[PDB]
Structure formats: structure tokens, C-alpha cells
Short mmCIF file of N, CA and C in Angstrom, two decimals:
data_model
loop_
_atom_site.label_atom_id
_atom_site.label_comp_id
_atom_site.label_asym_id
_atom_site.label_seq_id
_atom_site.Cartn_x
_atom_site.Cartn_y
_atom_site.Cartn_z
N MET I 1 -13.80 2.53 0.80
CA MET I 1 -13.57 2.49 -0.64
C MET I 1 -12.59 1.38 -0.95
N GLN I 2 -12.46 1.05 -2.22
CA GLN I 2 -11.63 -0.06 -2.64
C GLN I 2 -10.43 0.46 -3.43
N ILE I 3 -9.24 -0.06 -3.12
CA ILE I 3 -8.04 0.20 -3.91
C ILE I 3 -7.41 -1.14 -4.28
N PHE I 4 -6.48 -1.08 -5.23
CA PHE I 4 -5.78 -2.26 -5.70
C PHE I 4 -4.30 -2.15 -5.37
N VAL I 5 -3.69 -3.30 -5.10
CA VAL I 5 -2.26 -3.38 -4.86
C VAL I 5 -1.70 -4.43 -5.81
N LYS I 6 -0.81 -4.01 -6.71
CA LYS I 6 -0.26 -4.90 -7.73
C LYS I 6 1.21 -5.18 -7.42
N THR I 7 1.59 -6.45 -7.44
CA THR I 7 2.98 -6.83 -7.20
C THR I 7 3.75 -6.93 -8.51
N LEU I 8 5.07 -7.14 -8.38
CA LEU I 8 5.92 -7.33 -9.55
C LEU I 8 5.74 -8.69 -10.21
N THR I 9 4.92 -9.58 -9.65
CA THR I 9 4.57 -10.81 -10.35
C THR I 9 3.25 -10.70 -11.10
N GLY I 10 2.60 -9.54 -11.06
CA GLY I 10 1.29 -9.36 -11.66
C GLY I 10 0.14 -9.55 -10.70
N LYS I 11 0.37 -10.20 -9.56
CA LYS I 11 -0.71 -10.47 -8.62
C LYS I 11 -1.35 -9.16 -8.19
N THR I 12 -2.68 -9.15 -8.13
CA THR I 12 -3.42 -7.96 -7.74
C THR I 12 -4.31 -8.32 -6.56
N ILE I 13 -4.27 -7.49 -5.52
CA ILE I 13 -5.08 -7.69 -4.34
C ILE I 13 -5.96 -6.46 -4.14
N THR I 14 -7.19 -6.67 -3.70
CA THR I 14 -8.13 -5.60 -3.44
C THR I 14 -8.20 -5.34 -1.94
N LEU I 15 -8.08 -4.07 -1.54
CA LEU I 15 -8.20 -3.68 -0.14
C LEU I 15 -9.36 -2.71 0.04
N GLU I 16 -9.99 -2.76 1.21
CA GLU I 16 -10.97 -1.76 1.62
C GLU I 16 -10.29 -0.77 2.55
N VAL I 17 -10.33 0.50 2.19
CA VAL I 17 -9.60 1.55 2.88
C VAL I 17 -10.48 2.79 2.94
N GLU I 18 -9.99 3.81 3.63
CA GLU I 18 -10.60 5.13 3.63
C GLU I 18 -9.51 6.16 3.40
N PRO I 19 -9.86 7.36 2.93
CA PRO I 19 -8.80 8.36 2.65
C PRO I 19 -7.96 8.72 3.87
N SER I 20 -8.52 8.60 5.08
CA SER I 20 -7.78 8.92 6.30
C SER I 20 -6.83 7.80 6.73
N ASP I 21 -6.88 6.63 6.09
CA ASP I 21 -5.94 5.57 6.42
C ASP I 21 -4.51 6.02 6.16
N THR I 22 -3.60 5.66 7.05
CA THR I 22 -2.19 5.87 6.78
C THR I 22 -1.66 4.78 5.86
N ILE I 23 -0.50 5.06 5.27
CA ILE I 23 0.19 4.04 4.49
C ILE I 23 0.52 2.84 5.36
N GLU I 24 0.90 3.07 6.63
CA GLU I 24 1.13 1.96 7.54
C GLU I 24 -0.12 1.11 7.70
N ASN I 25 -1.29 1.75 7.80
CA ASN I 25 -2.55 1.00 7.86
C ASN I 25 -2.73 0.11 6.64
N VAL I 26 -2.38 0.61 5.46
CA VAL I 26 -2.49 -0.20 4.25
C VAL I 26 -1.53 -1.39 4.33
N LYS I 27 -0.29 -1.15 4.77
CA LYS I 27 0.65 -2.25 4.94
C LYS I 27 0.13 -3.27 5.96
N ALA I 28 -0.54 -2.79 7.01
CA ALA I 28 -1.10 -3.70 8.00
C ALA I 28 -2.20 -4.56 7.40
N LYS I 29 -2.97 -4.00 6.46
CA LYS I 29 -3.99 -4.79 5.78
C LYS I 29 -3.35 -5.84 4.87
N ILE I 30 -2.24 -5.49 4.21
CA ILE I 30 -1.51 -6.47 3.41
C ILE I 30 -0.95 -7.57 4.30
N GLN I 31 -0.49 -7.20 5.50
CA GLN I 31 -0.07 -8.22 6.46
C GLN I 31 -1.23 -9.13 6.85
N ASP I 32 -2.41 -8.55 7.12
CA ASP I 32 -3.60 -9.35 7.43
C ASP I 32 -3.86 -10.40 6.35
N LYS I 33 -3.83 -9.98 5.09
CA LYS I 33 -4.25 -10.85 4.00
C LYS I 33 -3.14 -11.72 3.45
N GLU I 34 -1.88 -11.29 3.57
CA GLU I 34 -0.78 -11.99 2.92
C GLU I 34 0.33 -12.43 3.86
N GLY I 35 0.31 -12.00 5.12
CA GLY I 35 1.31 -12.44 6.07
C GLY I 35 2.66 -11.77 5.96
N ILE I 36 2.79 -10.72 5.16
CA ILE I 36 4.08 -10.06 4.95
C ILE I 36 4.16 -8.86 5.89
N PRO I 37 5.22 -8.74 6.70
CA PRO I 37 5.27 -7.64 7.67
C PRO I 37 5.43 -6.30 6.99
N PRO I 38 4.87 -5.23 7.57
CA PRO I 38 5.01 -3.90 6.96
C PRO I 38 6.45 -3.49 6.67
N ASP I 39 7.41 -3.88 7.50
CA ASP I 39 8.78 -3.44 7.25
C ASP I 39 9.43 -4.15 6.07
N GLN I 40 8.76 -5.11 5.43
CA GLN I 40 9.27 -5.71 4.20
C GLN I 40 8.50 -5.22 2.97
N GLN I 41 7.65 -4.21 3.13
CA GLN I 41 6.77 -3.73 2.07
C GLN I 41 7.17 -2.33 1.65
N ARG I 42 7.28 -2.11 0.35
CA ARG I 42 7.38 -0.78 -0.22
C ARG I 42 6.15 -0.55 -1.09
N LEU I 43 5.42 0.52 -0.81
CA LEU I 43 4.24 0.86 -1.60
C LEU I 43 4.55 2.09 -2.44
N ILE I 44 4.05 2.10 -3.67
CA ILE I 44 4.34 3.13 -4.65
C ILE I 44 3.03 3.56 -5.28
N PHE I 45 2.82 4.86 -5.40
CA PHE I 45 1.69 5.40 -6.14
C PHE I 45 2.11 6.73 -6.74
N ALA I 46 1.65 7.02 -7.95
CA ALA I 46 1.93 8.31 -8.59
C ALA I 46 3.44 8.55 -8.69
N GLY I 47 4.19 7.46 -8.88
CA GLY I 47 5.63 7.54 -8.96
C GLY I 47 6.31 7.92 -7.67
N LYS I 48 5.63 7.84 -6.54
CA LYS I 48 6.20 8.22 -5.27
C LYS I 48 6.27 7.01 -4.36
N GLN I 49 7.36 6.92 -3.62
CA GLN I 49 7.49 5.93 -2.55
C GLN I 49 6.70 6.43 -1.34
N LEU I 50 5.69 5.67 -0.92
CA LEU I 50 4.72 6.17 0.05
C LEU I 50 5.26 6.04 1.47
N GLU I 51 5.14 7.12 2.25
CA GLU I 51 5.68 7.19 3.61
C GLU I 51 4.65 6.66 4.61
N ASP I 52 5.11 5.82 5.54
CA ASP I 52 4.22 5.10 6.45
C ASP I 52 3.24 6.01 7.18
N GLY I 53 3.71 7.16 7.66
CA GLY I 53 2.87 8.02 8.47
C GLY I 53 1.88 8.89 7.71
N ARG I 54 2.02 9.01 6.40
CA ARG I 54 1.12 9.87 5.65
C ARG I 54 -0.15 9.10 5.27
N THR I 55 -1.17 9.85 4.86
CA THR I 55 -2.47 9.27 4.58
C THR I 55 -2.66 9.05 3.08
N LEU I 56 -3.65 8.21 2.75
CA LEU I 56 -4.02 8.03 1.35
C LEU I 56 -4.40 9.36 0.72
N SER I 57 -5.12 10.21 1.46
CA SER I 57 -5.52 11.50 0.91
C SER I 57 -4.31 12.38 0.58
N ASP I 58 -3.22 12.25 1.35
CA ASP I 58 -2.02 13.04 1.07
C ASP I 58 -1.50 12.77 -0.33
N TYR I 59 -1.67 11.55 -0.82
CA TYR I 59 -1.16 11.14 -2.11
C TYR I 59 -2.22 11.15 -3.19
N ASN I 60 -3.40 11.71 -2.91
CA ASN I 60 -4.48 11.78 -3.89
C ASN I 60 -4.89 10.38 -4.35
N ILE I 61 -4.78 9.40 -3.44
CA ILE I 61 -5.22 8.04 -3.74
C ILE I 61 -6.73 7.99 -3.61
N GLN I 62 -7.39 7.53 -4.66
CA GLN I 62 -8.84 7.59 -4.77
C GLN I 62 -9.40 6.18 -4.93
N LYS I 63 -10.73 6.10 -5.03
CA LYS I 63 -11.37 4.82 -5.29
C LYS I 63 -10.82 4.23 -6.58
N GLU I 64 -10.56 2.92 -6.56
CA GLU I 64 -10.03 2.14 -7.67
C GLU I 64 -8.60 2.53 -8.06
N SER I 65 -7.91 3.33 -7.25
CA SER I 65 -6.49 3.58 -7.50
C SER I 65 -5.69 2.29 -7.36
N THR I 66 -4.63 2.17 -8.15
CA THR I 66 -3.73 1.03 -8.08
C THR I 66 -2.39 1.46 -7.50
N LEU I 67 -2.02 0.85 -6.37
CA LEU I 67 -0.69 0.99 -5.80
C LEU I 67 0.16 -0.20 -6.23
N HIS I 68 1.46 0.00 -6.24
CA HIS I 68 2.39 -1.08 -6.52
C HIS I 68 3.11 -1.47 -5.25
N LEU I 69 3.19 -2.78 -5.01
CA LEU I 69 3.89 -3.34 -3.86
C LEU I 69 5.20 -3.95 -4.34
N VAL I 70 6.30 -3.50 -3.75
CA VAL I 70 7.63 -4.06 -3.99
C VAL I 70 8.12 -4.60 -2.66
N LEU I 71 8.53 -5.87 -2.63
CA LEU I 71 9.07 -6.41 -1.39
C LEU I 71 10.54 -6.06 -1.26
N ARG I 72 10.98 -5.82 -0.03
CA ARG I 72 12.38 -5.49 0.21
C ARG I 72 12.75 -5.91 1.62
N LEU I 73 14.00 -6.31 1.80
CA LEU I 73 14.48 -6.61 3.13
C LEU I 73 14.91 -5.31 3.80
N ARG I 74 14.85 -5.29 5.13
CA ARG I 74 15.10 -4.05 5.82
C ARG I 74 16.59 -3.70 5.74
N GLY I 75 16.87 -2.40 5.87
CA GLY I 75 18.26 -1.97 5.94
C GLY I 75 18.92 -2.51 7.20
N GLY I 76 20.14 -3.01 7.03
CA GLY I 76 20.87 -3.63 8.13
C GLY I 76 20.85 -5.14 8.07
#
């Protein structure tokens, strides 16, 4: 299925995912397409900060859902 990832600059990227994908898997796809490492990515959906180990289905992320990507430097 297809989901969208929107950045704070307005840029929108389309990803192919499945409900069993983890949030880390989604970050890995963003790394594939954009070169940004998962540990610099914060993903947000439904007003929740998405946890790397949980799945898209855990967050009720569906076809054509839009996630928000916020870049951040790691703690430390």
C-alpha cells in the first residue's frame, strides 16, 4: 500500500509499505530514497510520535495516510 510522508518544508514523499512494517522499516525506506539516517528522523501520525519497533497497524496507519517527518539530531 502507499503512504505519504510530509516534511516541515512541504515536501511530500510517497512510500510503498505494508501494515506489518515497523516504523524503523519506514525510516529505512526514507533513508533509501533521501539518504537521511533513521536516527535523525522523527515520524508523527495521529498526533503521536511513532516508536521504531511498533508497526504501522499499531497506529491505525492505512492506505493514503499522511505521516509527518521532523528531522532532529540525536541526543548527546
